[PDB]
Every structure is written in structure tokens, then in C-alpha cells.
Design a protein around this nucleic acid. Structure first.
Lengths: 44, 53, 53, 43
DNA sequence: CTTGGCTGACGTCAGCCAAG
DNA sequence: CTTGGCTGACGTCAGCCAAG
């Protein structure tokens, strides 16, 4: 019941927390994606 | 007429709460699945960047 | 105490239903976000597939 | 349509969307190795 | 233009459980 | 051992709306 609370307030806060984490990592991998596409020019 | 209307709605309210319960469990289940797929795609895309950099 | 207990309970029932409604909308919102995030990661992975053959 | 009223319709929509993504997700993951081999071909 | 089928919202009873 | 705070599940009332 740790990852699955009883109170709805605890459930909402948990989903908010996870959403913040998932978005944070997503905004990192997609951020410096341009530097990767520039490395591609070296090949061709 | 009252007894009939009450019994019909009382029995039609139970199935309504059941469907909502299943719908909520569906969302929670779908959140968990999409969470795992998200984590995997991020981890692989991060590996695909390392592969060419 | 019954007249007080009922009043407190029926008042703690409205907020309970209100929090659940907020929780469901939260799940639906989180589902939509994880949808767009995953779809974006899929297309980007397919982009590096085409780019690097 | 996009936002149904009946719970049964909502569940059906969620399972439809889930099936489509999983089908698309398991295709991207399916042939990663083919892309992983391209690097060894380039290096 | 009605209706019947579902759902939203209500109040009440019952049960769980950390906090006394 | 109680209690009070929350939630599950019930039945009832009222309203929306595609199906007539």
C-alpha cells in the first residue's frame, strides 16, 4: 500500500510526482537531440 | 408503478458503479503500461544517441 | 452525537467524491500526456532509423 | 465520439488506443537490432 | 416533440485503520 | 481497548440525450 495509497489526495500527489519525473527526463532526451543530428553530417 | 421504477433504477445503478470501477481500473492499468513503454523508449533513444555520438 | 455525526459524515462525503472526480480527471490527463510523449519518442526513434538506415 | 458518455464506450476507446500503441510500440522495438547493426557497419 | 436507458450527485450505513 | 477521519457500496432523486 506504499505505491498504492488509500487517500485520494495521496494518489493525486503521487501521479503528479511521477508525471513531473517522466516529463523531466523526456524534456532532456528530446532537448539535445539537435546535437545528435549535427553529428550525422560528419558521416555523409 | 413506484416499486417497479425504484427496482429498475436500483438494479441499473449497481451496473453503473461496476462499469465506473472497471473504467478507473482500466485507466490505472493503462497508465502503468504507458509508463513502462515511456521508460523503455527513453532508455533506448538515449542509447541510440550514444550509438552515433 | 448522531445529528452531528451525520452532518460531519455527509460533509466528508462531498469532498470525498470531489477528490475522486479530481483523481479520475488526473488519470485521464496523465494518460493523454503519456500518449503524446510516447508518440513523440516513437516518431523520433523512427527518424534516427531512416537517417542512419 | 472522442469523449463518450457511456462507461462502456470509454473502456472500449481506451482499449482500442492501448492496442494501437502497443502494436506500434512492439514494431519499433521489434527491429532495433537492425539499426544496432548499422553502426557496426559504419564503424 | 416525448421516453427509456445511463449517469451525476446526494445522504446514509458499514467497515477499515492510523491515532489516540 | 476505543474513536475520528476516509472510503466502498447502497438506494434514491434529478437531469441529459441519442433513440425513437
Amino acid at each position: 500500500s506504499a505505491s498504492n495509497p488509500r487517500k485520494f489526495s495521496e494518489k493525486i500527489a503521487l501521479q503528479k510526482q511521477r508525471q513531473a519525473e517522466e516529463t523531466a527526463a523526456f524534456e532532456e532526451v528530446m532537448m539535445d537531440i539537435g546535437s545528435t543530428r549535427l553529428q550525422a553530417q560528419k558521416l555523409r | 408503478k413506484r416499486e417497479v421504477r425504484l427496482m429498475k433504477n436500483r438494479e441499473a445503478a449497481r451496473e453503473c458503479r461496476r462499469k465506473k470501477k472497471e473504467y478507473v481500473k482500466c485507466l490505472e492499468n493503462r497508465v502503468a503500461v504507458l509508463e513502462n513503454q515511456n521508460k523503455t523508449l527513453i532508455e533506448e533513444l538515449k542509447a541510440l544517441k550514444d550509438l552515433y555520438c
